[PDB]
Design a protein around this ligand. Structure first.
Ligand SMILES: *[C@@H]1O[C@H](CO)[C@@H](O)[C@H](O)[C@H]1NC(C)=O
Ligand SMILES: CCCCCCCCCCCC
Ligand SMILES: CCCCCCCCCCCC
Ligand SMILES: CCCCCCCCCCCC
Ligand SMILES: CCCCCCCC
Ligand SMILES: CCCCCCCC
Ligand SMILES: CCCCCCCC
Ligand SMILES: CCCCCC
Ligand SMILES: [Cl-]
Ligand code: NA
Ligand code: NA
Length: 551
């Protein structure tokens, strides 16, 4: 009957902050900056952060607060047509839940490797190391040598195969680790949904307090001055390639968990007369500051490795995912008692990723339960659903656990819940809000909800800045198209790129397909059909709290 509200604003802030501040900050941003050269990644990043990151994030939160519904029915309130956006988000988040947890699996594996006398990536004299491996300290002291940390990441953790078309034998240890993290998610969602809520004082303060330590270790490294420069001074030429702009925009959208329905649901649990604008601005500041400062530390470590190895910074580690699994495990080796600090670091990674996964999976489950309110949300009948959603997404994730699973992970990362699909969904959200619902019409709601009409920046972002940025990046990437590559050496087969585009299209096609379906359901001439489907169905149809009216 009545949606359960937050106990207080503190609960909302802590839940959301633990929600969108996770592995998209300490893991994705590092190698996304590293892959796109150096500081040339920052110029689009911040622009999107001030052009589409904060505005769309606050728009999602404010729609959730205005309609008090999840990611799906909120659109039906705002606009019956273009409802597929919600479905699109669901598909996106589903695919995200498939490969996001895989990262945690790796972290868990690393954790299980930490509990021993000497870290396995300190020196390379083990069975999995190629004879070309040479220790980092001895690399520049005196061809094509490899470092123990990278060896451990590829040969042992991943057992990397020649290509995607050679999946090979499934790795059982990583499969068990993925099962373990999915079991943690399952027992933290069906029961103990607020388990992290009562221990936030450890779940929120520790991940930051740990990062600072790395930062203190990062800057002190002798080569940091080089690395920070690589992280800061941009390259003008790199800005010409569409890849940097697409990566920066989609990294903004991924870090803030927008176009997923999680933000709308989180904003659906708060009060109507709640000043979510200021809270959202502070949370976005915290998110971007965490990303920027963590990049400082990891790029200082990269500069240290480059100066010690006698190699260029751009060729010191893996450009694809695993930079955070190459730089940070090397940094924790330099600290006194490396085992303890490595354990703490991977525990912090687990906390961040697990909290983010809890939020995303719970949002997806709530959305699907909204789609099936009688067939679900009936106790045990709901419980089984959880056991379904994890399992079908666990088995589907097992394709990323085979020793050729890294390439599949790269496909999912670049296409499934990131790339031109996120731009598609964000552009359609902003188009519906600005050019159909009306920016001033939604300011009429904001002014009543928070008590003051915000500045013209929010409306200018949805009206012009965000659609223009999204369409420009999309069309400019399609014009100067470069095939997706893993670690800038592997050239994907055509069928692999076809599968990745199928993954993107699974969510993209929801917007037009649902439009066609809704037009088919309604009767009459086309013009009155679209006019009737473009009328909001009383978005703030609530009287329990002090509210005004739609016009
Ligand atoms: C490593 O080998 C590759 C492939 O032959 C070559 O392109 C590259 O220059 C070599 N790098 C070093 C550091 O020897
Ligand atoms: C010879 C080992 C089995 C064949 C290759 C592994 C395939 C695992 C895919 C799991 C998907 C559920
Ligand atoms: C700029 C492209 C959109 C043109 C305006 C469409 C608005 C239709 C809905 C009107 C609601 C009264
Ligand atoms: C009108 C309500 C039903 C819309 C269903 C859309 C589902 C899209 C699935 C995309 C392929 C998995
Ligand atoms: C990965 C498939 C997601 C299916 C979502 C269905 C929404 C009605
Ligand atoms: C490492 C955390 C940095 C946070 C900066 C912004 C604080 C509101
Ligand atoms: C339930 C789908 C009905 C489709 C009817 C199509 C009429 C053009
Ligand atoms: C030049 C070092 C800056 C570090 C900011 C946290
Ligand atoms: Cl970020
Ligand atoms: Na978190
Ligand atoms: Na983030």
């Amino acid at each position: 009957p009545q949606r359960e509200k937050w106990s207080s604003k503190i609960d909302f802030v802590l839940s959301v902050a633990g929600g969108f501040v996770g592995l998209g900050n300490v893991w994705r941003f590092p190698y996304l900056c590293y892959k796109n050269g150096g500081g040339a990644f920052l110029i689009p990043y911040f622009i999107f952060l001030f052009g589409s990151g904060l505005p769309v994030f606050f728009l999602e939160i404010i729609i959730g607060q205005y309609t008090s519904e999840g990611g799906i029915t909120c659109w039906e309130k705002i606009c019956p047509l273009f409802s597929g956006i919600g479905y699109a988000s669901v598909v996106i988040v589903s695919l995200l839940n498939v490969y996001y947890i895989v990262i945690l699996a790796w972290a868990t594996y690393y954790l299980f490797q930490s509990f021993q006398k000497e870290l396995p990536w300190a020196h390379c004299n083990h069975s999995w190391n190629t004879p070309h491996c040479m220790e980092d300290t001895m690399r520049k002291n005196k061809t094509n040598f490899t470092s123990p940390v990278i060896e451990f990441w590829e040969r042992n953790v991943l057992s990397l195969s020649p290509g995607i078309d050679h999946p090979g034998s499934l790795k059982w240890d990583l499969a068990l680790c993925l099962l373990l993290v999915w079991l943690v998610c399952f027992f933290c969602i069906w029961k103990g949904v607020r388990s992290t809520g009562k221990v936030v004082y450890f779940t929120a303060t520790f991940p930051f307090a740990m990062l600072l330590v790395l930062l203190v270790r990062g800057l002190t490294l002798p080569g940091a001055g080089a690395g920070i420069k690589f992280y800061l001074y941009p390259d003008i030429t790199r800005l010409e390639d569409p890849q940097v702009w697409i990566d920066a925009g989609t990294q903004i959208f991924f870090s803030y968990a927008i176009c997923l329905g999680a933000m709308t649901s989180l904003g659906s649990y708060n009060k109507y007369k709640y000043n979510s604008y200021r809270d959202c601005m502070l949370l976005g500041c915290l998110n971007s500051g965490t990303s920027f400062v963590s990049g400082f530390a990891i790029f200082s470590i990269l500069g240290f490795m480059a100066q010690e190895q006698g190699v260029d910074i751009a060729d010191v580690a893996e450009s694809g995912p695993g930079l955070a699994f190459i730089a940070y495990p090397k940094a924790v080796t330099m600290m006194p008692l490396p085992t303890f600090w490595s354990i703490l670091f991977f525990i912090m990674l687990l906390l961040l990723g697990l909290d983010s996964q809890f939020v995303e999976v719970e949002g997806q489950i709530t959305s699907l339960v909204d789609l099936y309110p009688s067939f679900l949300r009936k106790g045990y009948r709901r419980e089984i659903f959880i056991a379904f959603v994890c399992s079908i997404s666990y088995l589907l994730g097992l394709t990323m656990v085979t020793e050729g699973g890294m390439y599949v992970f790269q496909l999912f990362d670049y296409y499934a819940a990131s790339g031109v699909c996120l731009l598609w969904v964000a552009f359609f959200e902003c188009f519906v809000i600005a050019w159909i619902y009306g920016g001033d019409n939604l300011y009429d709601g904001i002014e009543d909800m928070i008590g003051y009409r915000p500045g013209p920046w929010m409306k200018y972002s949805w009206a012009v800045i965000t659609p223009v940025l999204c369409v420009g990046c999309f069309i400019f990437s399609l014009v100067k198209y470069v095939p997706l590559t893993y670690n800038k050496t592997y050239v994907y087969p055509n069928w692999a790129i076809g599968l990745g585009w199928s993954l993107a299209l699974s969510s993209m096609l929801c917007v037009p397909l649902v439009i066609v379906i809704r037009l088919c359901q309604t009767e009459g001439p086309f013009l009155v059909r679209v006019k009737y489907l473009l009328t909001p169905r009383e978005p703030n149809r609530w009287a329990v709290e002090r509210e005004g009216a739609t016009p």
